[PDB]
Design a protein around this ligand. Sequence first.
Ligand SMILES: *Cc1c(COP(=O)(O)O)cnc(C)c1O
Ligand SMILES: *Cc1c(COP(=O)(O)O)cnc(C)c1O
Ligand SMILES: [Cl-]
Ligand SMILES: [Cl-]
Ligand SMILES: [Cl-]
Ligand SMILES: [Cl-]
Ligand SMILES: [Mg+2]
Ligand SMILES: [Mg+2]
Ligand SMILES: [Mg+2]
Ligand SMILES: [Mg+2]
Lengths: 356, 360
Amino acid sequence: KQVFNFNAGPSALPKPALERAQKELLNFNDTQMSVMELSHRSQSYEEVHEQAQNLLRELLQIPNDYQILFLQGGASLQFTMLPMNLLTKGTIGNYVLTGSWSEKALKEAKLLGETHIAASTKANSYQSIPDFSEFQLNENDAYLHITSNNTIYGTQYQNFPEINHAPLIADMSSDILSRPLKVNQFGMIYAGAQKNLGPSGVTVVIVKKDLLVEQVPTMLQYATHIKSDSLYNTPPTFSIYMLRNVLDWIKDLGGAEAIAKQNEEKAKIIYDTIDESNGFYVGHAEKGSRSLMNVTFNLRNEELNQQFLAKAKEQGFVGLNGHRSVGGCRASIYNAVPIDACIALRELMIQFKENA
Amino acid sequence: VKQVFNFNAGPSALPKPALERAQKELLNFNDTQMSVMELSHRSQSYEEVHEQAQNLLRELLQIPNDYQILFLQGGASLQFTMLPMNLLTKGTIGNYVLTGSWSEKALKEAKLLGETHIAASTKANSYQSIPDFSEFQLNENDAYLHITSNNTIYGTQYQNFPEINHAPLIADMSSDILSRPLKVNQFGMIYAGAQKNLGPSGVTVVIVKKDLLNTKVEQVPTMLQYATHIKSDSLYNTPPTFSIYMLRNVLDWIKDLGGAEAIAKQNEEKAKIIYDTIDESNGFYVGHAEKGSRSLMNVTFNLRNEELNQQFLAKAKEQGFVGLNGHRSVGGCRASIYNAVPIDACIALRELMIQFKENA
Ligand SMILES: *Cc1c(COP(=O)(O)O)cnc(C)c1O
Ligand SMILES: *Cc1c(COP(=O)(O)O)cnc(C)c1O
Ligand SMILES: [Cl-]
Ligand SMILES: [Cl-]
Ligand SMILES: [Cl-]
Ligand SMILES: [Cl-]
Ligand SMILES: [Mg+2]
Ligand SMILES: [Mg+2]
Ligand SMILES: [Mg+2]
Ligand SMILES: [Mg+2]
């Protein structure tokens, strides 16, 4: 009954968080009701809601002048909500393209206003993060948007640019809270929970308050949610409960620095395996841009790729097929993927290479 | 432990077997050794759940084949703007029937986007009834006519639905969807946040006439187009998988009890227990709704003054009752008695109400 969950989104969750959820699923906090059966205006729910925010604040050390929002719609809705709120006439939504998710965000902005590409590694099929000295910025930028971890391509920002002419905005869906962050570098950060933080259904938005509106639908104004503490309408209460639970697990293991140590060890196991394979496995990313969250690689040809992924699946590994747009293989090693799973993957990779 | 009676208005009581089923397989769903929360929404295990939730709805409400069932995020509140964004085009009018606060919120969002009209309204008499369909002021350039089937805050409910042929009839059915049989082809679109009568928060059910809305609307953000979700079968981006799973489990329970027709029978009986208590109270309890409009889902009432209101609600809370306080905008009391609220909770409430009255 061996299963190794390398799913890319939704993804593995910490066993203690799921076990805690199971145990109190019918009787939350001695109320004799599921957390799912509580009113979102009840104090019982309100404490959970606030506890999830508090844990994020603590774990990412989010300053007081930032607010933490829990929204629905996924990171995908943020792609349009952001320009809807910030891309005012005579300003420009400026994008750094480091993968296909970058492209999807830029597409939504083009609907609503003037856009620009500050830099892009598309020509080289997104094998790296561009040098910050190469960015083309504009006086009238409304924001600079980046994708911190390029989920499909397996590359990741090592650090972030020092931007002062406009707010820096980041889609951190696939690496939020996988390492310490300097939140003050950003005007806004957003992430679907379903990779590193919890189950699908909630989006975390960390926003500089004073940063962010005539004619925008009520539900699509950040101001609505800031003003109502993300309780303007009914929030995804069970997803926020599970987010709380995952955050308690991260706190319990030592926080963002401790989880970074685990994550770096996980990625080290896979990349070392690839690098020591003498070209049998080939990583897509340039070394300097290698993601710690999604490891992308291929075998020497499509038929070996296929034989590998078939053997993987038979041995209990789940989610290793690369994104359809790029093929190959992708090992997603988000926070809750245990080191034992990556070790198992290594051992499978080594045996397959030997037996080919 | 002591008794708990769950009259919460949204999210609300779930049927125990749906929760017990979720609890038992929470760590290992369908023998995959993963939680349904840990699966890819492209996995066959998830797709099965997603398809079953749709098929159960189709069968239970008898939805026609030219309608599609969408599972969206954002709540009913997001539908308030998505609807006029897709259908309220230039030169057309969003026509609304106002029968409570939720109707006003819908209208307000359309006013942001286009020409609106009010076909009829009971706002003047504080939304104690559903207006007569004969009073509906209709326009030839209406993009749709929008109603609220159950007015959650005021406790009133449509007994039946108007025949509309000049425009699509649209209904917010958040608080009474699948509480009774429905003739879906009366409508162009029905929407409901799931958390009142269908399951957990986090997913919104939208039943849509495919040809009214499977076409691209120029200038509308991809996520805000119905077309997007119709084309991708609600898998355009990552769905709320656990919410949809729980929705499936709740729909299975409704089917297991005999479907919409059987649940309507149960719902009328529960409601009768409370309204008869009110009606035999000689004015000690006063229902907000006029009798012909009384909701079967949300029973709204007041005692003779605010002091007695507060003492009644304090006593209830002390006796284990949860969620009876009226909506903050109107005060008084509100017994929400959605599908999964058990009839012995209603009997318990009656008992409370009668001893409070006798002892006051
Ligand atoms: C998965 C992902 C998204 C899509 O998120 P949804 O919640 O499915 O909208 C957006 N950006 C990145 C970087 C992602 O990895
Ligand atoms: C609760 C309610 C809503 C709001 O739903 P959200 O999911 O909170 O947006 C809308 N309409 C009716 C009739 C409701 O009862
Ligand atoms: Cl990408
Ligand atoms: Cl992806
Ligand atoms: Cl109402
Ligand atoms: Cl309500
Ligand atoms: Mg702890
Ligand atoms: Mg080495
Ligand atoms: Mg059954
Ligand atoms: Mg009982």
